[PDB]
Each structure stands twice: as C-alpha cells, then as structure tokens.
Design a binder for this molecule. Sequence first.
Ligand SMILES: NC(=O)c1ccc[n+]([C@@H]2O[C@H](COP(=O)([O-])OP(=O)(O)OC[C@H]3O[C@@H](n4cnc5c(N)ncnc54)[C@H](OP(=O)(O)O)[C@@H]3O)[C@@H](O)[C@H]2O)c1
Ligand SMILES: NC(=O)c1ccc[n+]([C@@H]2O[C@H](COP(=O)([O-])OP(=O)(O)OC[C@H]3O[C@@H](n4cnc5c(N)ncnc54)[C@H](OP(=O)(O)O)[C@@H]3O)[C@@H](O)[C@H]2O)c1
Ligand SMILES: NC(=O)c1ccc[n+]([C@@H]2O[C@H](COP(=O)([O-])OP(=O)(O)OC[C@H]3O[C@@H](n4cnc5c(N)ncnc54)[C@H](OP(=O)(O)O)[C@@H]3O)[C@@H](O)[C@H]2O)c1
Ligand SMILES: NC(=O)c1ccc[n+]([C@@H]2O[C@H](COP(=O)([O-])OP(=O)(O)OC[C@H]3O[C@@H](n4cnc5c(N)ncnc54)[C@H](OP(=O)(O)O)[C@@H]3O)[C@@H](O)[C@H]2O)c1
Lengths: 287, 287, 288, 288
Amino acid sequence: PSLAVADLFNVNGLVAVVTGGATGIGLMMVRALEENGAKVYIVGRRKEVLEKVAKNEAKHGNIIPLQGDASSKDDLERIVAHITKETGYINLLVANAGIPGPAPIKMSPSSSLADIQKDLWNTDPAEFEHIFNVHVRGAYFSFAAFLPLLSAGNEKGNVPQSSQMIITGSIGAFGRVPLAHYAYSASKAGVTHMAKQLATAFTKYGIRFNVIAPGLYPSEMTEEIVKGTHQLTPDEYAMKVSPLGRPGNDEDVAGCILWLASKAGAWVSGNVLVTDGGKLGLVPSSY
Amino acid sequence: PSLAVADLFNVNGLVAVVTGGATGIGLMMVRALEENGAKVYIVGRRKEVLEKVAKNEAKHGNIIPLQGDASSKDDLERIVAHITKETGYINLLVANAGIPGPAPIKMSPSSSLADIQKDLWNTDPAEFEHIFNVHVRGAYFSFAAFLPLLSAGNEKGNVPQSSQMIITGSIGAFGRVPLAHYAYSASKAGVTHMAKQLATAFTKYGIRFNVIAPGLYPSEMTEEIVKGTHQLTPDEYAMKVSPLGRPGNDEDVAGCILWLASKAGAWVSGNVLVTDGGKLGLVPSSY
Amino acid sequence: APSLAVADLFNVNGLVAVVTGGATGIGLMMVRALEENGAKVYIVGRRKEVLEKVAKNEAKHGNIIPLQGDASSKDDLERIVAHITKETGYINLLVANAGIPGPAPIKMSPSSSLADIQKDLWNTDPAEFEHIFNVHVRGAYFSFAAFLPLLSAGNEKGNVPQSSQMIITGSIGAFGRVPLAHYAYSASKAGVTHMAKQLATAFTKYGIRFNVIAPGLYPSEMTEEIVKGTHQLTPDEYAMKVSPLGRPGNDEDVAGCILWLASKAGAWVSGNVLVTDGGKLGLVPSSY
Amino acid sequence: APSLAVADLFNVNGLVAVVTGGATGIGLMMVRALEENGAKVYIVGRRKEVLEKVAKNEAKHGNIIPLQGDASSKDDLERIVAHITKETGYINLLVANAGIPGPAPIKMSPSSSLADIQKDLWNTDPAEFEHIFNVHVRGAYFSFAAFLPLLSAGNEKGNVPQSSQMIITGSIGAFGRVPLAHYAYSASKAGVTHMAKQLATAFTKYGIRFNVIAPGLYPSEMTEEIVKGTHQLTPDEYAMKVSPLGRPGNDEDVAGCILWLASKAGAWVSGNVLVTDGGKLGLVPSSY
Ligand SMILES: NC(=O)c1ccc[n+]([C@@H]2O[C@H](COP(=O)([O-])OP(=O)(O)OC[C@H]3O[C@@H](n4cnc5c(N)ncnc54)[C@H](OP(=O)(O)O)[C@@H]3O)[C@@H](O)[C@H]2O)c1
Ligand SMILES: NC(=O)c1ccc[n+]([C@@H]2O[C@H](COP(=O)([O-])OP(=O)(O)OC[C@H]3O[C@@H](n4cnc5c(N)ncnc54)[C@H](OP(=O)(O)O)[C@@H]3O)[C@@H](O)[C@H]2O)c1
Ligand SMILES: NC(=O)c1ccc[n+]([C@@H]2O[C@H](COP(=O)([O-])OP(=O)(O)OC[C@H]3O[C@@H](n4cnc5c(N)ncnc54)[C@H](OP(=O)(O)O)[C@@H]3O)[C@@H](O)[C@H]2O)c1
Ligand SMILES: NC(=O)c1ccc[n+]([C@@H]2O[C@H](COP(=O)([O-])OP(=O)(O)OC[C@H]3O[C@@H](n4cnc5c(N)ncnc54)[C@H](OP(=O)(O)O)[C@@H]3O)[C@@H](O)[C@H]2O)c1
C-alpha cells in the first residue's frame, strides 16, 4: 500500500500499443509511457515519422516503430502476428489514430440559407464515410485484432492492472456546435458509445475500456487552428480554446495516459476522461 | 387558442416525406399522418411494397409512392426534383430508413473468450460500414437534399408550425448492452448526436430537428425477435421487451409522429423522444 | 380499436387527474387542456381563492375540482388523498407541477470583481436553499408516496386503457449549465429529474409510468418579469435567452405535451424526458 | 519544465489542501496520499477526536492539520476559513468529500406487495430527506462560497503552477437508476454533480476549476456493512453489486484519482466527472 507517486504511477514493464503514436497527441502519450518505463509499439502509415520518433524521442530506446494501417483489417492481422512473435502479449491498446472530417460546413452571419445548402450538399460521400472507418470501424477491428494479445497480458501478469484498451474520442462527441464537420463529431459520438458498450461487455473478461476526450491540443490537425488563435480577443480564446487561457500540452496528455495505464487507474472502466481546459462547459454540449 | 384535440393534433395540408415508409415503424407513421390529413411521400427501394401500401393502406389516397435509395446521393437528387415538380415544397422530412447491423456478437455463458474473438473478428468490414452509410451518412444527405423543399414549406406557410426533420434513432443509441451489433448501436448514437447538432445549427433558420428513439416494435427487422418473445418468463419479457408487458403498436407510433408534426409539436426542437415501454430504465444505459 | 384518429388517440375522456400548481402558469395550461378534452382534474394549490377562480371561470365542462393543500407538506397530502379516496376512489394521473423560484440568482456582470461575486454567493440564505429542494424533490417524492394507492386503484377501475402515470415538471435547468437562476433551482431540478428516472426504473413493472416535462421559457407567475424584459433584446439575444424560433411557449405547446403523455397515445411512454424548450437548450451549454 | 516523469508530474509538494470528511473512508485515503506526496492538508470533521488520531497517526510528515467544523453549517465555515486565513493565508484545493447516507432505503423484495412498498415509501422521514440535501448540495455550495477568497489567494501566491481547484465527491448514484440507497441520496448526488458542472462553467474563467470524483463501492464507515455482506455472493452477483473486476476499491485507487487531479498533471482539467467504479455503472441501468 505504498502511496508514493513513483510507485503508483510508474508503467515499468508495461507493454503498450499506440496507433497514431508518432504525431500530436499520440506522440505525447508514447513519450510519457516510454520515459516512465514502458515498451510502446507505435503504429502509423508513414514509415518515416514512425522512425524519426523511435530514435530522437525515446529516452530508453523502447519505442518500437511498426508500420500499418490501423483501419485495414489485414494490416492489423500482420501487426498482431509480429507482436505475437516478438513479444507474445500486450497490456494496453491505445486507439488514437484519427483523421479530420470533410471540410466543415461554414455558416458565416452573411451566408444565406441558400448558400449554406450549397456547402452542405457539396460534402463528398466517400469522405463522410471514411472518417467513420478510421474512428469507429478502425477502433472495433483494432480491438478484435489485439484481443488475444490483450488476453495474454493478463496471463503473463507482468503488471498488476488489467489489460486495457483506451480510445481517443473527442469533446466533439458531446459538443453540439459543429466546429468541424457533422461527420467528425458524429463518428466520435459513435466510437465513444461503442467504447461504453465494450466496457459493459468485456470488463468481466478482464479488458477494461476507457475514453480520453480531448479539447484543443497542438497536433498536425490543429496546426492551423492554433496559429489562428493568436488573433482572438481574450473572451474568444476563452470560448474557442480554454477559459484557463491556453491549449493543452505534453504534460496534460502525460497525466491522463499515465493515470489510466498505471496501477493508479487499475480500477477504472467506462470512464470518459474530459481533458478540455473547461471548454465544454462554455459551448452547447450533451456531457 | 382552441385546445381541442382535433384542432391541436390534426395534420391537414401537411406535406411530408417518410423514408422507409412502407414497412414496420415507417408504415405506422404514414398511416397516422395520411388518415389525419396529410400528403405523405413514401420512399423505398422496393417499388412494390411502396405500391401495395399506397393503395390498400391509404384512407384518402394521399400516400404517393416514390422509389429511391435514401442513402444514394444521386437518387435523392432525382427524388427532390420530382417533389419540386409535383408539389413545390414539403413541411416534414422523416428519416426513418434503417437496416440491421452485421450479425450480433453472441456471448453465451458457455463461450470462452477465445471463442468470442472468433465471433468479433468474423464481422465483415463492408457491412459495419454500410450501417453507417444508411443511418448517418444517409440521414445527412437526406437533409442536404430536401433543405430547399423544407425552406419552401416555410414560405408557402400552409401550416403554422415550422418545417421539420425527424430522425428515427434507437434506444440502442443509449443502451450499453449490445443487443444487436456494436455497429447498429454506434451508428444510432452517431446519428442521434448529429441530430442534436443540426437542431443547434438550423432551428434559427426555421428547420427544427427531433429524434424518435424506439424500443421494441414489430417491423420486418424484429419479425423473428417478436416470435421469440412468446417463449419468455414474465420477468424476461419485462426486461427484454417492456415492463408494461407488450411491445409497441400502431397507436404508440401514431401518437409520437402526430404530436411532433402538428401544431402541438410546433415548439419542439432537439428533443429525443424515447418510446420504449420503460425498457431503457431496466438495462444499462446512458440516457 | 386501431383508430389512428386524433380525436380517438388523444382524447382524455374519463381520465381522473391531479395537478399540483394547477391554477397558474404552466399547470393552468395543463388543466385547461385536460378538462376541455374530457378529464376530471383536481387542482391543488395553497391559495384557495386562486383555485376557486380557475375552477369556476376556466373550466368548459365544470370538471376542475379545486382542492387546497400544500403539496410539500406530508400531512396535507394525507388529507388530500382521503378526500379523493372518498369522492372518487381512484386517480389515473398525478402531475407534480408545483414549483418555486430559487434564492436570488448570483449576479455575474462583466464589471463584477471576484471579490464582489463571493459577496453575492455567500449572501444566499441557507433556508431559501434548503427550501427549494423540499418543494421540487422532497415534495415530488411524498406526492407520489401519498397517491400511490389512488394510482394503483386507477389501474383496477380500468376507466382508461393507459396505465396510471405520474408526470413531473422538471426544467431545462436540470441540464443547462449556465445558471439563470440560483444554483439551487437548477440543482433541485436535476435532482428531481433523476429521481423520476429512478422511479420509472422501479415502478413501471408495477404499472405506474413516470415521465418528465422539461420546459424552456413559458409565461407564468415566476417568468412574468423575465417575459417583460425580453421585449428589449436584439433578435440575436432573444434567440439565445428565449428561443431561436422567436417566441416563448404558450397554451397550445403545453396542451400538446400533456395531452400526448396522458392519452392512449402516450400509453407506452415511461422514462421520457420531454424537452419543450423552443430549441434553447441546443444554444446554451448543457448536459442533455 | 517538460519533465514527463511520474515524480515531477504527480507530486503535490507545497500544495495547500482542505478535505472535508478527511478522517474516515474515502476522504482519509485522499489525505494520506496528498500528505505522503508533499502537501499540507487540513481535514475538517465534526468528531474532533477522530481528526486528532488521523492527524497524529496517519501522517508521514506531520502535515495533516486537524480542524473541527460542520461543513454544512454556514457559520462553522466562517470560523474555519479565518483560522486558515491567519495560519496560512491561502489554499490551492478544496475537496468537498463530506457525506451522509440517506434515509433508510425502500425495500422492494420480490415478495413485497405494492401495498407494502408504499408503507415503506411513506414512512420516510421528511427531515432525513431534507437533510441529506443540506450536506451534499447546500453544504458543498457554502463550502465553495466560504473558501473562494482563500482559493483566489492561492492563485496569487502561486506556490503551485496549477490553478486553484475545488473537487466534489459525488457518486455513481448520480447516474445509477436503480436506487441502492434512498431516492434522496441519489437525487442529492445528481443535484450536486450538476451544480459542479455549473460552477466549472461559471468560475473556470476566473481560475477556479471544478471537478467531480464519482465513486463506486469503497470501504468506508457507510459501506462497512455492505462490504461484510458482499462475502456471501455468487461471483455473478458480486460482479454486479460490486465490480466485474472482482473487488471493491482501495487506498491506491483513491490515491490515483486525487493525485492526478490535484497535481500539475490535472492542471488543465475542469468539468470532468471521474468515474472510479470498477466498471459497475456499465452493468446497472444508468444515465452516464
Ligand atoms: N488535437 C486536438 O485538439 C484533438 C481534439 C479532439 C480529438 N482529437 C483526437 O486525437 C486523436 C489524435 O489526433 P491528433 O490530434 O494527435 O492529430 P495528428 O497529429 O494528425 O495525429 C493523427 C495520427 O493518426 C495516424 N493515423 C491516421 N489514420 C491512421 C490509420 N488508418 N492507421 C494508423 N495510423 C493512422 C496518423 O499517422 P499517419 O498519418 O502516419 O497514418 C497520425 O500520426 C484523433 O483521434 C483526434 O480525433 C484531437
Ligand atoms: N422496430 C424496432 O423495434 C426498432 C427499434 C429501434 C429502432 N428502430 C429503427 O426504426 C427504423 C425503421 O425500421 P423498422 O423497425 O420499421 O424496420 P423495417 O420494417 O425493416 O423498415 C425499414 C425500412 O427501411 C427502408 N430502407 C432501408 N434502407 C433504405 C434506403 N437506403 N433507402 C430507402 N429506404 C430504405 C426499407 O425499405 P426498402 O427495403 O424497400 O428499401 C424498409 O421499408 C430504423 O431506423 C430502425 O433502426 C426500430
Ligand atoms: N414557467 C417557466 O418558464 C418554467 C420553466 C421551467 C420549469 N418550470 C417549472 O414549472 C413549475 C411551476 O410552473 P409555473 O412556472 O407555471 O409556476 P407559477 O406560475 O409560479 O405557478 C406554480 C404553482 O405552484 C404552486 N405551488 C408552489 N408550491 C406549492 C406547494 N408547496 N404546494 C402546492 N402548490 C404549490 C403555486 O400555487 P400556490 O402558490 O397558490 O400554492 C403556483 O400556482 C416549477 O416546477 C418550475 O420550476 C417553469
Ligand atoms: N464509500 C463509498 O463507497 C462511496 C460511494 C459513493 C459515494 N461516496 C461519497 O463519499 C462521501 C463520504 O465518503 P465515505 O464513504 O468515506 O464516508 P464515511 O467513511 O462515512 O466518512 C464521511 C465523512 O464525512 C464527514 N462529515 C459528514 N457530514 C459532515 C459535515 N456536515 N461536516 C463535516 N464533516 C462531515 C464525517 O466526519 P464526521 O461525521 O466526524 O463529521 C465522515 O468522516 C459522500 O459524499 C458519499 O456519498 C462514498
């Protein structure tokens, strides 16, 4: 019953997998996990980027890059086989990979309703379709693929906490003001619900499910939005970014992932972690 | 300020469109709407069924059958053009079309976890992908297609209530026990959220959005589940069907659609109508 | 019979109903629609002279029976139930609509320092607080506890095909995260809304359905002033403080809700939160 | 500095905290982790002798300062704030953890008639009701109103990089729709949970973040009996009344939550409901 931070929150010997682990939020996660004792497979579509981050960003050489398309049912099969070969188990799957939606439907006070349909109808049917394959379908099959590996990590018992899958949702799953496209938000709402359904099914089998629901974070997606923020009256930053007056950072993400992956988070299943800076309390939502 | 039921709840002169209007729930809607004064275009993929129901089921000959694929962006364009030709406006779009998901992942107490992945991984990637095109993408483009027609119904002013789009969700959007496949539920959660986002955007433009969230109803999907119910201890019917001891019926659906489409419902936007017989209160949910 | 006709579906002929706060504001619009469309409606208030006017003047068939009582007082409920258990023997529908406004709201004007806003916060009286909760939550609980035999009897007399039912007037303040009243009002409505979902979970299996009506802005005795104030609002503020449809609610809106849920149309509804808000909730920070 | 190291991220060195109910059960596990990891922790209870034991015996650095008071009493709060305003001058973290169990729960056994279940329902005492709401909701409000200067001061002293913060111990009973306690307990927790979201909406812009910890089953003074009872449960009932992970919570679980939200790790969290339930909520009817 040692309550020291270094004992509670370390992830020594934890074997983790992070899709989208080489940029933005996913990167801040693997940097937190590896610096504090873990072996973190990062899975991306760009073999570079995965490489550059495996070297350079590791502090102990425990970022193992592993190229794959987390939405492709067959790339998952080859990625699982490899990790079954090289390691035999994992303890933590983090479904963080994500795309931005179709272009947002712009509604400027000087847009007629006739113009806003022009926008609405232009949206391409194959995009708004794909965001759903990455965010929802892709999460489902990621779980289906690693479930033996996750079941094995419970048997090896290298960590006292249960095997666990974390899913990067969005506060867009609750924010009712379409700041992106209705498809990003709708897919995040869909994956957030599926996550609660999986915790309902599979916690009894010893695989806990949790959702991290981020506000505004500097990633490759938000690169431009973050640049734009520098041009906002305080009262706007406070409503579009955070009333605490900043977007999130490495340490914020480090706290979340380290809390839920360690023994501290060993009894958490079905939690939606809202790390938003307080933004959700300021926009119309359903949280 | 006449408060008589016949004055409040009539839909005389209302021009409505109901996808999936020729079977199950959608049928009970168009029968309620047409019997009480409306012109109801029913849109389906089977030209028959739409026909059989246009004759036979109408009581005033105001069911106009109109074949189309409500998910196909191009069939919507031809359906809109036709209704713009023949009528010029609509007052009410009802996105009721729906498919059942992939086969549910069965979890029988005598299934090992090794077996339940076998199930989970078998799910086809093109199905769990399509339910999302019908339920979410298909709803979006249905709104995008009829938005001029809905904007016109506000101008013709044949009814005092605003133009309105209703979307048939599901209590599966909140039920956390996967009674179907995680994709049905996840798509319904996604469309339910998009509906709240559209009410947030477009009520100010005079198009109200509402969701009907049905429990167990005798349709073509539930045909078998309803047969199976006859074999349940009361305490099971009460938890899998309704603690009131029956599934829903024509009059239940008639009440919902007639309430939200008439002047009675003229001030409702953003409501999720849960017509479930009380089931949701008995299963793990997030409502 | 499968009559999908408005006059057959939505009539409340022979329905015996009880409406607390039934003589002003929202509660009045409910009794006027229930009685006009065939019901016998007991209205329960404390101001007996207000009940008598409504019962004589607002009825169209003389079926508003005024009956003075304090719906929060456990002992007034006991005497009210008895009168009905004698004069009538059963009810089909209990409507817990009685409500008070909270303590004074905490003013947060852009030119208030945080030092000033505590001055406000701390001034709130502990009894106005502890009191809004007795009317809205405790008062609803005991109203249900008192009428439960009468509600169980209405299932036996079977004068209506729908189950016996209790409706509770909550608020969109149960989900709205910007307090337009005191944190006590909103917190009590959130509390009663949840208790209502818990009662539908318990008691639908025994044939008493529970539902919540969650109103936006409605002209009542509580909102009178706020409604007067609305007349000085840019369209854009009005669309956000009131409704993007450009009006507050009215008799017919309330008539639709209560007539839908009390009739055979609503006979299969239990655990629904009916949000009749004009779309406001979609515009303010909420948790709906 | 961007030290992504557990000892740098999650330490609470120099944090000045206040924990109501900090001498038993959950509140104790919080102070033991805050103090062991570097904080000065005022514990506020009514039983002064229980505060003194914990402060002498459970500290590892002698930084548990016992301080008797009634967290629901508006006037005891006034005297507590003053002591701290003199002895210390600021706080960084207020934890409203004090709580009571409700009235006796309404027993609904399969062999209870509905006539019997009203007997139960109506027996509930109007004061036990009106009282659970004063501790859980009213008591939380005035605790915030009292410490708001002290919380505003901790932002100025800047002994920690994170904002001043108030945490509120809610319950998964705020979402669980099957009442395992009285409808009053659940309804008060739902009410305080909502007020907490409303306060984060108001006061994060002024630099006081609000968050809710929502516990499942934890061994405290309130749950002692229930925990004893669990030892006679088929695995399947235990998985549903307790947790599908097969245990109730413990010191380390609570330590993780409070240390995550009070440290620099949690410095950007406002409006989060932390559900630490072992997965129970996913198994019972809920509204989360
Ligand atoms: N940043 C924010 O403010 C914010 C807010 C709310 C939610 N989120 C969520 O945070 C998550 C992370 O995105 P981010 O913000 O960190 O943006 P980012 O910097 O663009 O990271 C996205 C990552 O996803 C990977 N990825 C995308 N599709 C993939 C696939 N099919 N297979 C494997 N990897 C794939 C990309 O790697 P490749 O391109 O090499 O494949 C990329 O590294 C997303 O789910 C996003 O929705 C972010
Ligand atoms: N019944 C229940 O218990 C229940 C419960 C929860 C939710 N729901 C929802 O209720 C809605 C109605 O389904 P139902 O229960 O009435 O089942 P149903 O009897 O099978 O009705 C479904 C209808 O959808 C139509 N449809 C499907 N895809 C379409 C498309 N792309 N374009 C046009 N029409 C299309 C079908 O017509 P065609 O086959 O001719 O195209 C069919 O008439 C669905 O959204 C379902 O998810 C039902
Ligand atoms: N008006 C709105 O816009 C609005 C919006 C959201 C929610 N609501 C809710 O609607 C309800 C009130 O409706 P309203 O706005 O129409 O209020 P109102 O015009 O002020 O009338 C409320 C009625 O409650 C009665 N009442 C109060 N306490 C009572 C008690 N202990 N026993 C018996 N009767 C009692 C009052 O009659 P006596 O004083 O004579 O007893 C009064 O007639 C409350 O639940 C309120 O929160 C209203
Ligand atoms: N234990 C669980 O499993 C669980 C689950 C969900 C929620 N909770 C919540 O956790 C909180 C209680 O934690 P617990 O379960 O550990 O309870 P506990 O063991 O009974 O201790 C609660 C503490 O509250 C203090 N307290 C009560 N009223 C007070 C007041 N007016 N002023 C000051 N102190 C007061 C008591 O100290 P004195 O009596 O000496 O003042 C006591 O030490 C409540 O909010 C409860 O609803 C607990």
